[PDB]
Amino acid sequence: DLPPVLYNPTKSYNVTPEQVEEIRELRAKDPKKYSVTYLSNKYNCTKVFIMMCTQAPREHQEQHKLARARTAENWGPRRAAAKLDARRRKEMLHRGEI
């Protein structure tokens, strides 16, 4: 037999051309309430696909980048260095260096 399975995903198509429009009007109506997680669970999709059909307005996106930047300034020199190492190992991996 073959060795154990580690990653065998299954693609699904649960959204229709009409439901895609509902995802667009909702995301633009209230991006705070109709988050991508809420729309993902509502239409039984992946959080990525929700982002492939529509994007939040530029105003809602800037506050997301700020929220992640404010939590980053709370890191000390020891945690900020470990975070940067984790981001470099990933880039090095895809360059064939790891």
Place this chain on the structure above:
RNA sequence: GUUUGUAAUAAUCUAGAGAUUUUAAGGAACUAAGUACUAAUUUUAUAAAAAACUGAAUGAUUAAUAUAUCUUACA
């Protein structure tokens, strides 16, 4: 409280060195309790750098994409 011991003044007595009384007097390094009388008392004194890796469980938020082309829209 404890300790030392009956200060001075005054009264009386005394050859006079002294005695008696006021007198358990007057003191005191010490102990205990109480008391803010003195000192803890000058305008952001100093030091302290501060959340690793992998697996598992379980959340939040988000383009967390690519290819073709050079024009597109407005006025």
